[PDB]
């Protein structure tokens, strides 16, 4: 429902985009569990069509051919092993549920699928489910191309085909039931909740009808009254017919205005300044905090022409991406999702990356394992932003401050700002083109604190910058606009 169902005191999830199940299981044990991560959003676990032109794009995973748990990430036994191993170290699994459609209406008939199931897209045949012609919306679409021609018409957005994908007749109980049996199988395996893909393309009541069929979570890992966490992917930046509020009664909704506006402010575009973030959250017109799933970027818009366009910050803009993710993880608004990506061979032509369809690192189509090096970074083209010290330590900061109110805001009237969370954490940012040198009230008890952005508290010492907070809570902050990271963060568990 609205509660994430993470283990108590864990406050973020990470999207391990296109990772294989065996690698995620290992990552839960060696890293996510010990480092306090709440959970992992996984790529669609159900069987999809194989796209050979272009060669195995990441987007083929959003074109279902059955609900069998067999993909390039692994098979059902590997998926079950991952969910168990992660739940056992306190890390939940959330599934990307692709339920609005099946594969492209133009895909060829046959067994060119990730588990070898047969399908005949042209004749609306999906025997592995099973689905047939009457289970799709072709008869409802009022457009001439069969596609969505105007986003100011909710009926075409919900009933017509999204980029040529066969649109499921979600008002039918048979269809609502096939989808629920799939989600309930995942709940039985131990999943904690779901990202409902392409929610704007479904009627609010049809999604609720499917949700009404879901069981409570598995009692080997969750208390008996527990409803699955639901976050609906609705892209609503304003100025269109469909609003994110239409879905609030079903569960949380992705707040895409968050990353779009934060990226514009952090880049200092369109006259925006960091000092304007004093009233960040509902004051900027966003949805209620208790209904929001927030993030700086996602797998679609980190490619540059998604929701937010070029203002979206990504790992390619690492210096500013870290400050945006750090501000997000320190601020109380919303439930936070961090991104973990792969690097692809970009190829710009006339200013555009024509290679943005490229799928995960692979050897002849088999996804590469995630290798871990000693500096704790990753190999094999995986970026592993969730392992960057500055992000890992801020997800720990958000756990440490859980519940504490936004407090002690300061700004220099331009792009230097700071704020705390009750008496448990404080963060300071310098996004101006000059030195930050200020005495600030931190709200924290006096002591010597390790800055968790530049280092870590190890034993009774700090490996980075030390911040000396006096008994009245004040501390001297000095941050160069050219520092490795132009922000500092300290909290109760970083005190010596």
């Amino acid at each position, epitope marked *: 429902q609205y509660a994430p169902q993470t283990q108590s005191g864990r406050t973020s999830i990470v999207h391990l985009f296109e990772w294989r199940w065996v690698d995620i299981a290992l990552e839960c044990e060696r890293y996510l569990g010990p480092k306090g991560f709440g959970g992992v959003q996984v790529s669609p676990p159900n069987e999809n069509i194989v796209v050979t032109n272009p060669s195995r794009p990441w987007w083929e995973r959003y074109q279902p051919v059955s609900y069998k748990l067999c993909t390039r990430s692994g098979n059902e036994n590997e998926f079950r092993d991952m969910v168990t191993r992660c739940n056992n170290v306190g890390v939940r699994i959330y599934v990307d549920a692709v339920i609005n459609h099946m594969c492209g209406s133009g895909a060829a008939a046959g067994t060119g699928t990730t588990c070898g199931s047969y399908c005949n897209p042209g004749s609306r045949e999906f025997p592995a489910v099973p689905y047939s012609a009457w289970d799709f919306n072709d008869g409802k679409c009022k457009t001439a191309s069969g596609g969505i021609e105007s986003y100011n018409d909710p009926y075409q957005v919900r009933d017509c085909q999204l980029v040529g994908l066969l649109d499921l007749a979600l*008002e039918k109980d048979y269809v609502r039931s096939m989808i629920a049996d799939y989600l309930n199988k995942l709940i039985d395996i131990g999943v904690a909740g779901f990202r409902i893909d392409a929610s704007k393309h479904m009627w*609010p009541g049809d999604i609720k009808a499917v949700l009404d069929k879901l069981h409570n979570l598995n009692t080997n890992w969750f208390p008996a009254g527990s409803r699955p966490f639901i976050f609906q992917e609705v892209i609503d930046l304003g100025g269109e017919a469909i609003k994110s*509020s*239409e879905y609030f*009664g079903n569960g949380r909704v992705t707040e895409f205005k968050y990353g779009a506006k934060l990226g514009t402010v952090v880049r200092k575009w369109s006259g925006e300044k960091m000092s304007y973030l004093k009233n960040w959250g*509902e004051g900027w*017109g966003f949805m*209620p905090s*208790d209904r929001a799933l927030v993030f700086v970027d996602n797998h679609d818009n980190q490619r540059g022409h998604g929701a937010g366009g070029s203002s979206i910050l990504t790992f390619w803009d690492a210096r500013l991406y870290k400050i945006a993710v750090g501000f997000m993880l320190a601020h109380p608004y919303g439930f936070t999702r961090v991104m973990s990506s792969y690097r692809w061979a970009r190829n710009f032509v006339n200013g555009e990356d024509v290679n943005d369809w490229i799928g995960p690192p692979n050897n002849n189509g088999v996804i590469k394992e995630v290798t871990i090096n000693a500096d704790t970074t990753c190999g094999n083209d995986w970026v592993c932003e969730h392992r960057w010290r500055e992000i890992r330590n801020m997800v720990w900061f958000r756990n440490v401050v859980d519940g504490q109110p936004f407090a002690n805001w300061w700004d220099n009237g331009s792009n230097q700002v700071a704020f705390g969370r009750g008496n448990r954490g404080f963060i300071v940012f310098n996004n101006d083109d000059w030195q930050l040198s200020s005495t600030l009230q931190t709200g924290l008890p006096g002591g010597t604190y390790c800055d968790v952005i530049s280092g870590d508290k190890v034993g009774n010492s700090c490996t980075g910058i030390k911040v000396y907070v006096s008994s009245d809570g004040t501390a001297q902050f000095s941050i160069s606009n050219s520092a490795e990271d132009p922000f500092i963060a300290i909290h109760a568990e970083s005190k010596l």
Partner: nanobody
Amino acid sequence: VQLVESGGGTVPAGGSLRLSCAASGNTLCTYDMSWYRRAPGKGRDFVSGIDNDGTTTYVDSVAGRFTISQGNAKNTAYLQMDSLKPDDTAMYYCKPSLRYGLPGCPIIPWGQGTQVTVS
């Protein structure tokens, strides 16, 4: 189907008002209801909503002071606003959202709203 909004007025801080919203004329249609408000110079922001199953959502600034409920009949809702503060002053708009698509159930556009002035 027509959108009918009512209840606006001027009360002093601490007073109450109750807004009403109805999307009547075709009982086969089902509309979920959500109120937004626009103060001069601010944007039109969500404040409270309720779906057909009675599930409520409130923005934090009105929690415990505003109560949204299903009205007299299907496709009707009320927004009981108590302990009004001067910052609650704004033009309020009910936006009915179609819950299920059906032949001849229209999408309803923003209406004119109602004016609420506190103090």
